[PDB]
Each structure stands twice: as C-alpha cells, then as structure tokens.
Structure 1
C-alpha cells in the first residue's frame, strides 16, 4: 500500500528554500495580476434599482478599540480587516434554486501545499492563490461581478449597517449551568453531591424526555449572526472596517460581512458603490480614513460643551 507523503519529504536541503521562494513569488505575482479588474474585460456595470442586493466580503477580526462621538459617549468598535478578497465563481438564477443568483467569495490566502487536488485545480483554472474560507452570497443578477475581481474594504461606507457572521468561540463539553444558565442547588445546607446538576429533566407521566430538552453538551462552536451593526469608519490603506459593537468569534478568525437585512435598513443602498467599489475608474483617490459625521476624529479640537 502507498504510504503518506507531504510536500517537502523528498526535497533536498537546498531545494526547500528555492521551492518556498518560487511559490511565494508566483502567488505574489498572481495576487498582483488581478489588481486592475476594470482594464481586463469587466462584466457590464448597472445602476442601482430599489429591489437590489449586492455582494459582501470576508474579513479577519483583528481586535477591539474604543471610539468617541461628538456628544461625548463612548462606543466600542471591532476592527475587521479585509485581507485578500476575491470573487471566485458565479452561479446564475436558474442553476441553484430558481430564487436568487449566487456569488462565491474567498477569504485570506493560504498555502497550496495544504489543500485538496480539486481545489488546487479550481484555483489554477481561476488564477489565484487558494483561500481559507469560501462563502456564498445571494445577489440579484444585475449586481453580478466578474469572477477573479478584487473586493476591497471601501465596498462599505461609513454610515450603513452590516451583519457579521462567524463561528463563535468553542467552549467544549460544558455543563448545564454555564451552558443554559441554569441555577444549581444551594451550597451547604445539607446537599449531597448535587451542586451543579440539572435536576429534573421531564415529568413522570411521559416516560421519556422531549427532543428539545436542555442537557449538557458541546457548547459554542456554531455559526451565529450579529444583526444591525453600524460601520463607523473605513481605513483605505490597510483595508480595515470599523463595525460597531462586538462580533461573534475569536480574534483573527474569518467573519462574513454583508449589509443588513433588517426592515429598517431595507433600501439604504442608493449611495453605495453598486456593483462594488472599483478603485480604478473612481478618478479620485479616497482619503486614508473615511469618517462618519458623528465620530470625533483623532485630530480634533477636544470637544467643549456649551
């Protein structure tokens, strides 16, 4: 039988730095080749209609930071950085469920040496280094973008509402008090080996427990979605988004960010770049920071009330 193998098993002492340098230079050139999508052969750009839904991104949660507004209040922001985002493939409206067209979007770059063969074939046909995570965005087909294009962080604007979704922090096989917020039994008034138990789990007539019963079990490694997060500020040099409040998942995981689906923010996308912000044809480079009109900037006259 065939034994296992890895990439550098049979490589020499001198060939390992050469292969690292070679493949690093190749996927750096591949990332730099897709830099100007508007000069290649772009798919037709449409104007915004009111019943439209555009694509999102995949960002990497750096950390948190405080952030002050002109009334004096303090808000906390999560810095989501868009590391290397690329539209991968497009599936038309009649080819998934007959409801809405889909777009695939890839996350940050990882090594070719640690993916399956069909995935490497897919990225070799597409022309990009392989991505860590791949999310599927429901869009309407007047917002379709060409596969292989770059998506940036100025896709979103300061003053908007996004919905971020990631895997929450996994806490292992957790007992019922930390998981479901049950109370326990009291501590010292006679209790025998029952300080954190679930107690009764059903009634006596039924002879079973219901399927929806709350019991101990693995807690916290599940996709959750944080709804209605305001984006306060966009940094365009490092491609960092500043969403309001907390975001599910640990730091340096990958989150999926798209604009809100709440009814209050149904059609606020008329002032947003629609197909996606293209930094080529803008004819005016954006500033290094795009602020909402409420946030105190770092260069500020140190607000005085009156």
Structure 2
C-alpha cells in the first residue's frame, strides 16, 4: 500500500514533526559554515591548465545594467542557495580523464527523496539537494565534501558558462520548432498553412535520420557560453551574468568557468579552490562591481 510521511500522523503531531525536521536542517547547514576550522584538504596555488569547481545557482530574473560608456546591458540574477560540495571522485576511480566533484544545490524535503539519496546525505550530514551536477577538475583543485560554495567564488570581469534545461514548449509543429516558412494563406492552399512540405526525396524510399519534423521542443539542456560577470552581491549570494541564461525563472543552473579558448588562462586572479569567507582576509564588501559598471549611488555620468 502507498504511504506518505504524514498519512498516519495526528493533528498535533504534524506541526511538531515539521518543526523538528526544519530545525535539524537549519542546524546541519549552520554546522558547515567554517570549513577551514574543520580539517581541510590541502590548498594549492593556481597553475596554468588547472580547472576549478563551479556552482549551482537559482535563476531569480533579469534587470538592466548600465556602463560608463552609456551602453545598456541586460543581466540575469543567479542566486546561490545552499550550494555544497557533495562528492569527490579520483580520475582512476571515475575511469575518466579528470577528477570530478559532485556539487548539489537548493535544499529540498527529506520526505520526498528516495532512501538511497537520504542515506548518502545522512552520511554527509547535510539536508538533501534538488540537483547534483558534476564538475571536471584537476587534482590540485580538490575540495573536501561538505564545504559550502558562495557567489564570491566568481569575480566581476570573469566569463562563465551557464547550463540549464530550456523552457519546455511541449509538442510543436515545424514552424515553431524549426522555423519552417509554411505555406501561403490564400490563393488556394486547401489544408496547407503550417505543414512540413516534402519530408524527403523521391528516390530514397525512406526518411533520413535526424530530419526536422514536429515533436517535443524545449525541456533539454543547453549551454550559454562566454557570459560576463558584471557584479557580485556577497550578502545575498547573487551573480550578475551578461545576457540571458536558458530555462525559466526559479530553475537551477550550472555555472562554471568559460571553456572558450580566449578565456583559457584568465583564472589567475580568481580564488583557486574556492572562496573561503572564514579566512577573513580583506573582508569583501556587499557589492563587487566591474570597472565599467555604473554603480547605483554614483553621480550621473557625463560623456567627457
């Protein structure tokens, strides 16, 4: 028989259980605020060719941003919510080219997770997370699981890649799916307005694999490359990324350093393993801006 958590609970037991589990989650999250005080994995200086871990952020929405030159750039707000390192795998163990870090984001209910996942998080001592994404790293970039990740990991002027599931448009015809021109409205055209024309050629008694036909569009992973980080809000853990990222608002996006060859070795100035707030050397302000960004509270710009 099917069972949910609060099926067999009393009227007064439901609020108690809710409070109990919520408090435990809060405690577990608060426990991990100081990774350096706990026994850390060795921190190495940055080297050319090294790749560091990324983050999982929530797409808040978009706002305009201005520059001193006067150009307006739209930016997307990515909030980092309960982002922790979950798992490390060595290159030999993974049977892959590089070491991997599994990183999770956005805490969710314990009641709605499978036993396997619950057991894994129990061993960690962290509340379960909505999405887990895998980041290919070098050995020198290894971070102990349980370590929190913050928006200040990225810095303004840096370029990032953003990966999310696109907005699902469901089943779509050729015109919305592939931008087929369709057929004219009048001058006949009995039942042909939005139809695919000739699907294939006469001679082949078949249709080629991968022909553009009506089907399900959206709801697939896409990556946006070379998006500039304009601003960090350290208080709320907000990353301001240039332009639009895939997916709906309140979705979870995978943010890593840009893979583009132009921005290959620009990781020199960035905090290598991650940013550790508990280090407390030159405590960062609320807002980190790029040089070009017109900060709010600044005087009105004149083009001199």
Secondary structure (helix, strand or coil) at the match of 2:81 reads coil
Superposition deviation, residue 284 in structure 1? 2.5
Counterpart among 229, 246, 249 of residue 248 in structure 1? 246
Q: TM-score, normalised to structure 1's length?
A: 0.99
Superposition deviation, residue 282 in structure 1? 3.1
Query: In structure 1, how many angstroms separate the alpha carbons of the residues matched to 2:107 and 2:82?
Result: 7
Query: In structure 1, how many angstroms separate the alpha carbons of the residues matched to 2:3 and 2:96?
Result: 43
Secondary structure (helix, strand or coil) at the match of 2:226 reads strand
Query: In structure 2, how many angstroms separate the alpha carbons of the residues matched to 1:285 and 1:108?
Result: 26
Gaps of 5+ in 2: none
Query: In structure 2, how many angstroms separate the alpha carbons of the residues matched to 1:123 and 1:141?
Result: 24
Superposition deviation, residue 97 in structure 1? 2.4
Superposition deviation, residue 277 in structure 1? 0.3
Secondary structure (helix, strand or coil) at the match of 1:241 reads strand
What CA deviation, in whole Å up to 9, does each residue of 1:44-79 have, x standing for no partner?
Answer: 000001110000000000000000000000000000
Partner in structure 1 of residue 214 of structure 2: 216
Query: In structure 2, how many angstroms separate the alpha carbons of the residues matched to 1:300 and 1:71?
Result: 14
What CA deviation, in whole Å up to 9, does each residue of 1:155-200 have, x standing for no partner?
Answer: 0001100000000000000001000000111101011011111010
Counterpart among 77, 93, 110 of residue 95 in structure 1? 93
Query: In structure 2, how many angstroms separate the alpha carbons of the residues matched to 1:62 and 1:266?
Result: 28
Gaps of 5+ in 1: none
Query: In structure 2, how many angstroms separate the alpha carbons of the residues matched to 1:296 and 1:159?
Result: 14
Query: In structure 2, how many angstroms separate the alpha carbons of the residues matched to 1:304 and 1:280?
Result: 41
Q: Structure 1 residues 95-104 or 238-247, which shifts more?
A: 95-104
Secondary structure (helix, strand or coil) at the match of 1:108 reads strand
Superposition deviation, residue 36 in structure 1? 0.4
Superposition deviation, residue 305 in structure 1? 1.6
Secondary structure (helix, strand or coil) at the match of 1:238 reads coil
Query: In structure 1, how many angstroms separate the alpha carbons of the residues matched to 2:95 and 2:260?
Result: 23
Query: In structure 2, how many angstroms separate the alpha carbons of the residues matched to 1:280 and 1:199?
Result: 63
Superposition deviation, residue 283 in structure 1? 2.3
Tell me the matched-pair count.
304
What CA deviation, in whole Å up to 9, does each residue of 1:206-231 have, x standing for no partner?
Answer: 11010021100000111000000000
Query: In structure 2, how many angstroms separate the alpha carbons of the residues matched to 1:283 and 1:182?
Result: 57
Secondary structure (helix, strand or coil) at the match of 1:133 reads strand
Superposition deviation, residue 285 in structure 1? 1.5
Query: In structure 2, how many angstroms separate the alpha carbons of the residues matched to 1:29 and 1:98?
Result: 36
